[PDB]
UniProtKB/Swiss-Prot annotation:
This is Toxin A. Disruption phenotype: Cells lacking tcdA display virulence and cytotoxicity, because of the presence of TcdB. Cells lacking both tcdA and tcdB display a strongly reduced virulence. Belongs to the clostridial glucosylating toxin (LCGT) family. The chain holds residues 1914 to 2126 of 2710 of the full protein. It comes from the Bacteria. Cell wall-binding repeats lie at residues 10-29, 30-49, 51-70, 72-91, 93-112, 144-163, 164-183, 185-204.
Amino acid sequence: NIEGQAIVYQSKFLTLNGKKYYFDNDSKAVTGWRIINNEKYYFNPNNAIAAVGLQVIDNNKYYFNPDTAIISKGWQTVNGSRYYFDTDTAIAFNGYKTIDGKHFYFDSDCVVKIGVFSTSNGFEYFAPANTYNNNIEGQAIVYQSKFLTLNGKKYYFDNNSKAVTGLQTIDSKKYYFNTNTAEAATGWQTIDGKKYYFNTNTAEAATGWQTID
């Protein structure tokens, strides 16, 4: 053609300066969600450029593969964070999920969660990678009746693979846990109108002629 003439261009992927464009049977680039060869492509309404990474449409999160612009489903690790997506709709999950019978938990931000959280069953632990002999980072485990310490705070389990929150003294040492935080209290605590003091490094109630400062 002459330079700048809008020529006919149909049914092929156009790559221009690293971007991606798709044209219909006519000579116009397409916008919005598009299906070619069952791949679930997406294009911007004001640029017609395919997506690169995480792209929230209105409220649902998404992931698109860089250098190919095809959507990806399943466990996708982007920017040093773990994500999981749907198979039918490819939406990142929010909340505790029953996928594969392992009770994965997610936040409103779709990064994976590590620690103990208040679930529907109660307070169930979620473990990092390579703690259990075959575990996914963020998968609930069969941890039973052992003391666990993550970033200073401590709490104790039971035989039902759950986190307890009562007083429940063990070997004449009381380990009070919070009713919602489910962590052991440290320092001064005025519970039920009475005074109890637990230690800093450990979390038992000191008894006897115990002197503070």
